[PDB]
Design an enzyme around this catalytic site. Structure first.
Site, PDB file in Angstrom:
ATOM      1  N   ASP A  45      -6.668  27.134 -11.085  1.00  0.00           N
ATOM      2  CA  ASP A  45      -6.371  28.270 -11.919  1.00  0.00           C
ATOM      3  C   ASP A  45      -6.825  27.930 -13.331  1.00  0.00           C
ATOM      4  O   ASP A  45      -6.850  26.757 -13.717  1.00  0.00           O
ATOM      5  CB  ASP A  45      -4.875  28.538 -11.891  1.00  0.00           C
ATOM      6  CG  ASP A  45      -4.489  29.697 -12.755  1.00  0.00           C
ATOM      7  OD1 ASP A  45      -4.929  30.826 -12.445  1.00  0.00           O
ATOM      8  OD2 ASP A  45      -3.751  29.474 -13.750  1.00  0.00           O
TER       9      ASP A  45
ATOM     10  N   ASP B 276      -0.382  32.428  -8.288  1.00  0.00           N
ATOM     11  CA  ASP B 276      -0.978  31.278  -7.610  1.00  0.00           C
ATOM     12  C   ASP B 276      -0.131  30.875  -6.407  1.00  0.00           C
ATOM     13  O   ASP B 276      -0.549  30.048  -5.607  1.00  0.00           O
ATOM     14  CB  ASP B 276      -1.066  30.059  -8.536  1.00  0.00           C
ATOM     15  CG  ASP B 276      -2.090  30.221  -9.630  1.00  0.00           C
ATOM     16  OD1 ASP B 276      -3.139  30.839  -9.356  1.00  0.00           O
ATOM     17  OD2 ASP B 276      -1.854  29.711 -10.747  1.00  0.00           O
TER      18      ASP B 276
ATOM     19  N   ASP C 282      -0.283  27.451 -11.949  1.00  0.00           N
ATOM     20  CA  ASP C 282       0.911  27.405 -12.794  1.00  0.00           C
ATOM     21  C   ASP C 282       1.713  28.701 -12.677  1.00  0.00           C
ATOM     22  O   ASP C 282       2.908  28.709 -12.912  1.00  0.00           O
ATOM     23  CB  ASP C 282       0.514  27.176 -14.269  1.00  0.00           C
ATOM     24  CG  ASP C 282      -0.156  28.412 -14.920  1.00  0.00           C
ATOM     25  OD1 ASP C 282      -1.064  29.023 -14.311  1.00  0.00           O
ATOM     26  OD2 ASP C 282       0.225  28.776 -16.059  1.00  0.00           O
TER      27      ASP C 282
HETATM   28  N1  LIG Z   1       2.191  40.895 -20.074  1.00  0.00           N
HETATM   29  C1  LIG Z   1       0.957  41.462 -19.960  1.00  0.00           C
HETATM   30  N2  LIG Z   1       0.806  42.790 -20.364  1.00  0.00           N
HETATM   31  C2  LIG Z   1      -0.421  43.386 -20.270  1.00  0.00           C
HETATM   32  N3  LIG Z   1      -1.539  42.747 -19.792  1.00  0.00           N
HETATM   33  C3  LIG Z   1      -1.356  41.439 -19.400  1.00  0.00           C
HETATM   34  C4  LIG Z   1      -0.158  40.707 -19.442  1.00  0.00           C
HETATM   35  N4  LIG Z   1      -0.310  39.472 -18.997  1.00  0.00           N
HETATM   36  C5  LIG Z   1      -1.604  39.450 -18.681  1.00  0.00           C
HETATM   37  N5  LIG Z   1      -2.282  40.595 -18.899  1.00  0.00           N
HETATM   38  C6  LIG Z   1      -3.752  40.976 -18.689  1.00  0.00           C
HETATM   39  O1  LIG Z   1      -4.037  41.218 -17.317  1.00  0.00           O
HETATM   40  C7  LIG Z   1      -5.120  40.404 -16.923  1.00  0.00           C
HETATM   41  C8  LIG Z   1      -4.683  39.617 -15.675  1.00  0.00           C
HETATM   42  O2  LIG Z   1      -3.427  38.967 -15.507  1.00  0.00           O
HETATM   43  P1  LIG Z   1      -3.422  37.889 -14.352  1.00  0.00           P
HETATM   44  O3  LIG Z   1      -1.989  37.338 -14.397  1.00  0.00           O
HETATM   45  O4  LIG Z   1      -3.897  38.331 -13.017  1.00  0.00           O
HETATM   46  O5  LIG Z   1      -4.437  36.831 -14.960  1.00  0.00           O
HETATM   47  P2  LIG Z   1      -4.310  35.778 -16.221  1.00  0.00           P
HETATM   48  O6  LIG Z   1      -5.537  36.037 -16.988  1.00  0.00           O
HETATM   49  O7  LIG Z   1      -3.057  36.242 -16.890  1.00  0.00           O
HETATM   50  C9  LIG Z   1      -3.838  34.141 -15.879  1.00  0.00           C
HETATM   51  P3  LIG Z   1      -4.798  33.079 -14.908  1.00  0.00           P
HETATM   52  O8  LIG Z   1      -5.900  32.615 -15.847  1.00  0.00           O
HETATM   53  O9  LIG Z   1      -3.878  31.951 -14.585  1.00  0.00           O
HETATM   54  O10 LIG Z   1      -5.290  33.806 -13.662  1.00  0.00           O
HETATM   55  C10 LIG Z   1      -5.020  39.256 -17.894  1.00  0.00           C
HETATM   56  O11 LIG Z   1      -6.162  38.436 -17.894  1.00  0.00           O
HETATM   57  C11 LIG Z   1      -4.675  39.969 -19.203  1.00  0.00           C
HETATM   58  O12 LIG Z   1      -5.861  40.470 -19.785  1.00  0.00           O
HETATM   59 MG   LIG Z   2      -2.133  30.737 -14.991  1.00  0.00          MG
END
Ligand SMILES: Nc1ncnc2c1ncn2[C@@H]1O[C@H](COP(=O)(O)OP(=O)(O)CP(=O)(O)O)[C@@H](O)[C@H]1O
Ligand SMILES: [Mg+2]
Ligand SMILES: [Ca+2]
Ligand SMILES: [Ca+2]
Ligand SMILES: [Ca+2]
Ligand SMILES: [Ca+2]
Ligand SMILES: [Mg+2]
Lengths: 994, 994
Positions: free
Chosen positions: A351, A707, A703
């Site tokens: 991740d 996942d 994390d």
């Molecule tokens: N609390 C929140 N409110 C609105 N959008 C959010 C959010 N948390 C994350 N996002 C957006 O949604 C997209 C996807 O979230 P997701 O949890 O699937 O990936 P991630 O980018 O947060 C973490 P990882 O890199 O571990 O996959 C994010 O990349 C971000 O742009």
């Molecule tokens: Mg993450």
């Protein structure tokens, strides 16, 4: 409290005298701590004090020997007169070797558990609570929680104690309590009370149990019971069992163990048969009943001497040793198998956010619209300072500090960041720094609004603790949050429904504040805000917005971006059904674009190199993330998954693109692509699955709760120490340290553990074979008995004892991490290996008979000289012609045997020095590389010389000390075994592979 | 049989149906053997299976430590929380070292007893009986004796079984039964029955008990009970105890042991005092009660660490080892002390006949009177052939065979030899050779008459068994033996009273046949016989007789001579009172000289050299004998007591001459003379006593009853295996082999055992002193604690354990037998030795503090550097000026201690290599001279490195592994100890002695 589920929220608050908005008072907390103690269970230190021992005696092999000991002991009470001593010793010679391993095992096992039990004890668990002490939710050691104060919990969290839900801060609250109710699926919760006072945990849909995790939603509640009084604190190990199982490598080693058992059992009863004509010999004189029992005893002795008794323990020791080595590197191995499995790892899906990166977010860039002149569109970019969560930094416009409140667009931008946000900030007085409470990405926005201070609020005259959420609180007073449409990865956004508080903004109506992934939000925007005005979204504006997102994304800082918008005219509060998050995206439509923010989330320092080493070991590292593909590829180049200027147009996908491919191509893209973005949690798993359809060993590192699936699907799941509990639960290993490198080291150990296992089986077999081809080669060439029961049992206790076990302490080869991973299908024992076994096993067995004969023959100053007459050795009783005349009872001299038993022991010890590797020269990998092996040898040798020079012994062992010259004959016939193997190694090394 | 004493001789004969003249019939013997079994007791194999162990735990020293173990264990249950482990180990560290010796001891003890129990089992006991089988008394294994057959027994013999005396063949029959009745004095026996059926053994004056010895007289009797039914077979160990005692060297070592105990007890409570001001320190924090217990524990730890626990066992091991070494040389040590005592032996008084010589007599010369012509006198010399007892040889006159019967004088000569003779001859069918029955000197005469065959008897048509006594029997038929005046050493002769059988010689009257030492008999001869005539003894005749006796005596053959005479007109059978042998010489007067005989009795081959070696070791060898002074001096020159042409007129006496000297001169002559002849059994003792009035260690070697007194008087008695039982009983050692040399070897062992004892006490003290001057030198210079309880107990178990015990296996110095014997008064520990002790004990103790300091100071890459500030180490808590700032808790680091504890162990092991001798260089006496010592060291070392590198251990022992460089610091400060001692040795060697 008790039966808290039966009462209502008011009754529970009432029962403890606490406001669900205020929380306990420092005084109340002091008292409750005395009236209820800390929220912790009795220190369950390393137990199984005795059980561990008895565990050593379970495998089939040790059972057999354990049986032979009983037999040898029964025959002892039935042996008479002149050698009852030599009979009562045999069993103890079997029992000893067994006990010697039971200890090294139970000992290693002990140290393992402790190291692990000590690593868990390290970083204390925390909890989120509300207390009069402070206006905002604060963090605290979970053990300090007492029944009474208000506690908060959210998606991914580990429930700290038995909580009576008071309020659900989201449309749904799903929980994972399998650890208790056993039900796998996440169950839905409510605030409605459950009247049945004797209801089962599975019926208390308004309770949260300590130990379970939040699968979804957010909720605030009141603590009912803590410590030992918890629903899980009762079912503790002290009042409830657990579970176990055997590792796959062990499943294959037991299948191999028995396989040997059968073979050994045959080549033994064979000996008892090829000697039926001797039951009637002068050596026995007695009936065929007395002569049989002897050869029967020799059979069992050969059995015991052949059975690899230390296999079942050496494996346990290597594993425990692995576990312990990982602990020393701050890695909690929640499953022994893990270490082994990680060795065959070919692909590691990791991740991004939080795993490959540090997840310490900080908004350092942001922009809103400046002017929209038809075809021309300008933005108002800003820069923010301060990399931590501390509310200390400045907002700069053209490198010069400015009042954010000056810009209307920036006021809304902060309104949104503050309102459509589920996290907060808490100052840690101890460490003297602001820690986040909730998701880092969201908290980043929290510190942001603190920095902007759009309403110019007096913050200078405030404390560290108060300065943390001040500005945020202010904005919370302008709007009332009716409800929030929690973030969901299908939408890629989150929303919040608000109504104006006073009559200052009342003349505008209700609003909805959205924020999510740029792509998604910007598309559901029909208007772009300019100052306080609104204009329709156009190509050119859309163009500017995205281009700068792209700029910041793949920029030198590889920024993680988030869009912010508002629904000026939200749907009628009634027309909205919060039944399923699938309906939310619709509510977030016809939006008005407000601005974007860019945060930095620096990749972990140790990651880059780890990926390199992973490459050298021929292990692939794919990145999976929900984030933007642009910034995803950007970071990939930064960490080394991709070359600074490498074309990746074919090795990087977005869940959209991936899904667009036909099934066969998805599968194919998985073994080609090294980066997957804007991918959902179902995609992560699927990617792992495709990677497994190719019979590979996949590892998953994550994390977050997104996942969980993948971490389970994989062969081995590795979770971040600072990650969610839901991720840790679905993992076989946990990097408490958060050090990515440890994953690499866990593979080396996995590889070494296998290698040692081989070198052990290689030694025990290439040696024990001689102990058989020594018994048959004599019953073939006709020579006299070469060994007796007690004699065999001795070679065993000295060649199959500690010297073999110490083999589990052999260092890894000087290139164990420069060779591709071993196929999961690869056979435990290769053909060339079986050759290696018979090659050595044959020589050693022949090098023994050639020694027992040598004395009889070429014995220079050595007595009892003769020539080839040995074949007919029981015939000087009647027909002794050529016989020089030397006593017709010289064919029963101890000299010969004691001369061979020494070569045997001696040559086997030499063979151990060949087990320090498989193909590496004993010159490249010195024998002193494994001090533990040497010490094992010296001890073994000493233990032998002792059996030869301590008056009582040599008699009991029917042996007789050797000449200071006859020994040199052993070091002459045994020492060459090193060369036979040294040469074979040169073959498999230079000839075969290499 | 039973109550045989109550019945009469006829009743007893009757009860078994046997003629006291014939004996059992081969058939009867067969049956009785089945009805009564063999005359033997249950095999009393090496017992004390468990007792031996408990014996190891008796001495004061082992008790102390055994007490400390209990204390350390009680304090364990009262120690809490964080170091309960390090508390439960201490006791086991004390218990272990104790157990390690208990085994080496009980093991050595076992082997000893066995070797001895096996040497006894060697040559089977024989017995003299009469059986129908043969006309003459025959020999047989004593175990074959059955109740019923007639048995014969005589002076010196061991009664084979419980016998009912049937007939006394002498004026008196005295017996020694102390072993049973306990009465020391020899009791008189009779044939008169004792009517009391429940009489006590002390009242059965007509019985002879198995196990007792014949003190005097000869008797024939019937066996009443054998085997287990014997009066002594009931009081056996299985139904009766025994006795023990501690050796003198041990009496002096226990006096020294306690002496150390007291000192050690003081220098320990001293430590507990010089640290009362620390009971109130931060290191303890607790009350003075918690701080005291600690220093109290350190005291006991220093005690244990000082107490020489292995002394009480090393002594037992050396002794047992001595015993075992003697057995391997066929020497039965009937008393452990023996071996030690023999080392201080300065004088060895040895008997001649049977001891220095072989006692295989054979008459090879003899003469009778030829003519007496006033002033002229001629003799008729003859020569006899055949050196064994076989009746095969020829009588030669002028080198030509002659019919002895031809000469009248020779007929009488044989009459006398055959009649006045208490022994006989028996042919051993098995070995196929004639064995004597009785005294060799007498038996020599028996074979003689067989050779002469004076009455020309058909002997050609006879068997081996019959040819043995044939001629003798014939002469027994001519005269009736009325009674015999048994031989007595005051008279130096023996006599026999006879009456003519038929009417062939009836016209002559009764006769008395005498034979004894020439001097005595020839003087009591008034007539010399010529043929059948008689003429008065004259000067000239007396002159010829003696001159030839002298010739034969001091001749090349050193012949043992005997005179033969007859009393033509004996006293009236009534006028003679056989009350006391003192009246017999009178009855043997007015005799008629008949002839003389000369026999050869070759000295033992190994004797000559043994006397030489005895000389080199500065041990004197005096010869004591009843024999003629001439032949006595003759043999002395032959064996080396005297030089071939050495003037001995002043170093050789006859009991007569000796007694002629005034008391003061007798005493004086004993330390001057090396040969005493015609000396009585009272003279032998006296000689030994005089030798003891000079405080010397006297050894006595004999074979006869005339050696009993002396053998007892001496410090150590050594008896011949083939000698009388009465001599063996009064001896501490028995040369079963009869090898004189073994006596020499017994002295070397005695000398070596002492030496090793010294080298051990030397090691343990020169080392344990450092372990004290290490504790005080630190509490003096002010430095921090150098060791803890568990730490001390460890140095103990590794320096005072096996490495010390293995010191009892040190070979003898290359000159242990070239230095005069050690004075019995010499002090156990010489002054120069105590210096050696403090010299080393001081350096080692200072070489430890200088190491704990070295780390603190000159630690190069070694952490925690500082300078001299160590003295004030508990003051950085308030006043830390010069203090660079390094943690004020570095004065409690394990690094320092673990750095010293290693030097300690290490230097002590080096000190062991100095205990391989007292003054010999470690270069002259290589360290590898005692493999057992090396192996003890390696084990000890290994056991230490183990406590440093096995994770759990270093923690429990508050230690921490040392750098591959810090160790070299130990081998740097410890290794030099070799030089300190090597130099001191060069002093005591070249400077002092030498
Ligand atoms: N609390 C929140 N409110 C609105 N959008 C959010 C959010 N948390 C994350 N996002 C957006 O949604 C997209 C996807 O979230 P997701 O949890 O699937 O990936 P991630 O980018 O947060 C973490 P990882 O890199 O571990 O996959 C994010 O990349 C971000 O742009
Ligand atoms: Mg993450
Ligand atoms: Ca085996
Ligand atoms: Ca083997
Ligand atoms: Ca000691
Ligand atoms: Ca010592
Ligand atoms: Mg004698």
């Amino acid at each position: 409290m008790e039966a808290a589920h039966s009462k209502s929220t008011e009754e529970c608050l009432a029962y403890f005298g606490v406001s669900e908005t205020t929380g306990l008072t420092p005084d109340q907390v002091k008292r409750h701590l005395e009236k209820y103690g800390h929220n912790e269970l009795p220190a369950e230190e390393g137990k199984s004090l005795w059980e561990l021992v008895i565990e050593q005696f379970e495998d089939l092999l040790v059972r057999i020997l354990l049986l032979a000991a009983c037999i040898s002991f029964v025959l002892a009470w039935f042996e008479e007169g002149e050698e009852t001593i030599t009979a009562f010793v045999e069993p103890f010679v079997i029992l000893l070797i067994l006990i010697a391993n039971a200890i090294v095992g139970v000992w290693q096992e002990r140290n393992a558990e402790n190291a692990i039990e000590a690593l868990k004890e390290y970083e204390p668990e925390m909890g989120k609570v509300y207390r009069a002490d402070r206006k905002s939710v604060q963090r605290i050691k979970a053990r300090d929680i007492v029944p009474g104060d208000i506690v908060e919990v959210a998606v991914g969290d580990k429930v700290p104690a038995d909580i009576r839900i008071l309020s659900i801060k989201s449309t749904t609250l799903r929980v994972d309590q399998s650890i208790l109710t056993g039900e796998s699926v996440s169950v839905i919760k409510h605030t409605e009370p459950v009247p049945d006072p004797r209801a089962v945990n599975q019926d208390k849909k308004n309770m949260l149990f300590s130990g379970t995790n939040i699968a979804a939603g957010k909720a605030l509640g009141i603590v009912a019971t803590t410590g030992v009084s918890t629903e899980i604190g009762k079912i503790r190990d002290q009042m409830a069992a657990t579970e176990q199982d055997k590792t796959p490598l062990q499943q294959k080693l037991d299948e191999f163990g028995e396989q040997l058992s059968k073979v050994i059992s045959l080549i033994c009863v064979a000996v008892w048969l090829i000697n039926i004509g001797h039951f009637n010999d002068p050596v026995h004189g007695g009936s065929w009943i007395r002569g049989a029992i002897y050869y029967f005893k020799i059979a069992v002795a050969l059995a015991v001497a052949a059975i690899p008794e230390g296999l079942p323990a050496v494996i346990t020791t290597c594993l425990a040793l692995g576990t312990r080595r990982m602990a020393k590197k701050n890695a909690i191995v929640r499953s022994l198998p893990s270490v082994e499995t990680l060795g065959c790892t070919s692909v590691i899906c990791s991740d991004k956010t939080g795993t490959l990166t540090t997840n310490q977010m900080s908004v350092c860039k942001m922009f809103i619209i400046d002017k929209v002149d038809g075809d021309f569109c300008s933005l108002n970019e800003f820069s923010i300072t301060g990399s931590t969560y501390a509310p200390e930094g400045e907002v700069l416009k053209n490198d010069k500090p400015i009042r954010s409140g000056q810009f209307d667009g920036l006021v809304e931008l902060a309104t949104i960041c503050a309102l459509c946000n589920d996290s907060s900030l808490d100052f840690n007085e101890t460490k003297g720094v602001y820690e986040k409470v909730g998701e880092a990405t969201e908290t980043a926005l929290t510190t942001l609004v603190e920095k902007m201070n759009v309403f110019n609020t007096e913050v200078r005259n405030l404390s560290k603790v108060e300065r943390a959420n001040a500005c945020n609180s202010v904005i919370r007073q302008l709007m009332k949050k009716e409800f929030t449409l929690e973030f969901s990865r299908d939408r890629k956004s989150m929303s919040v429904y608000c109504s104006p508080a006073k009559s200052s903004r009342a003349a505008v109506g209700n609003k909805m504040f959205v924020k999510g992934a740029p792509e998604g939000v910007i598309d559901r925007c029909n208007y772009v805000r300019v100052g306080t005005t609104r204009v329709p979204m156009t190509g050119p504006v859309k163009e500017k917005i995205l281009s700068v997102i792209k700029e910041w994304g793949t920029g030198r800082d590889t920024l993680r971006c988030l869009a912010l918008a508002t629904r000026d005219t939200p749907p009628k509060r009634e027309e909205m059904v919060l039944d399923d998050s699938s309906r939310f995206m619709e509510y977030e439509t016809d939006l008005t674009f407000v601005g974007v923010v860019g945060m930095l989330d620096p990749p972990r320092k140790e990651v880059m190199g780890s990926i390199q080493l992973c490459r050298d070991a021929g292990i692939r590292v794919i990145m999976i993330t929900g984030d933007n593909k642009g910034t995803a590829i950007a970071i990939c180049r930064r960490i080394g998954i991709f070359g600074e200027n490498e074309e990746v147009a074919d090795r990087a996908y977005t869940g959209r693109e991936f899904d667009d491919l036909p099934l066969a191509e998805q599968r194919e893209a998985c073994r080609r692509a090294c980066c997957f973005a804007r991918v959902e949690p179902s995609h992560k798993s699927k990617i792992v699955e495709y990677l497994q359809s190719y019979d590979e060993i996949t590892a998953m590192t994550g994390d977050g709760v997104n996942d969980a699936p993948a971490l389970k699907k994989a062969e081995i799941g590795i979770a971040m120490g600072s990650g969610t509990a839901v991720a840790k639960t679905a993992s076989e290993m946990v990097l408490a340290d958060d050090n990515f490198s440890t994953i690499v080291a866990a593979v080396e150990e996995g590889r070494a553990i296998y290698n040692n296992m081989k070198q052990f089986i290689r030694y025990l077999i290439s040696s024990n074979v001689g102990e058989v081809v020594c018994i048959f080669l004599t019953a073939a060439l006709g020579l006299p008995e070469a060994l007796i029961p007690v004699q065999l049992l001795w070679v065993n206790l000295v060649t199959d004892g500690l010297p073999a076990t110490a083999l589990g302490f052999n260092p890894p080869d000087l290139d164990i991490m420069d060779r591709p991973p071993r196929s999961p299908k690869e056979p435990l024992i290769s053909g060339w290996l079986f050759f290696r076994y018979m090659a050595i096993g044959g020589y050693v067995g022949a090098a023994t008979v050639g020694a027992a004969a040598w004395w009889f023959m070429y014995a220079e100053d050595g007595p009892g000289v003769t020539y080839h007459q040995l074949t007919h050795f029981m015939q000087c009783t009647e027909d002794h012609p050529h016989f020089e005349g030397l006593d017709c009872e010289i064919f029963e001299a101890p000299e010969p045997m004691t001369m061979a038993l020494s070569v045997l022991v001696t040559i086997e010890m030499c063979n151990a020095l060949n087990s320090l590797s498989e193909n590496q020269s004993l010159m490249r990998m010195p024998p002193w590389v494994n001090i533990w092996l040497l010490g094992s040898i010296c001890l073994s040798m000493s233990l032998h010389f002792l059996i030869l020079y301590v008056d009582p012994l040599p008699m009991i062992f029917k042996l007789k000390a050797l000449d200071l010259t006859q020994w040199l004959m052993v070091l002459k016939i045994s020492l060459p075994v090193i060369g036979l193997d040294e040469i074979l190694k040169f073959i498999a090394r230079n000839y075969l592979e290499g």
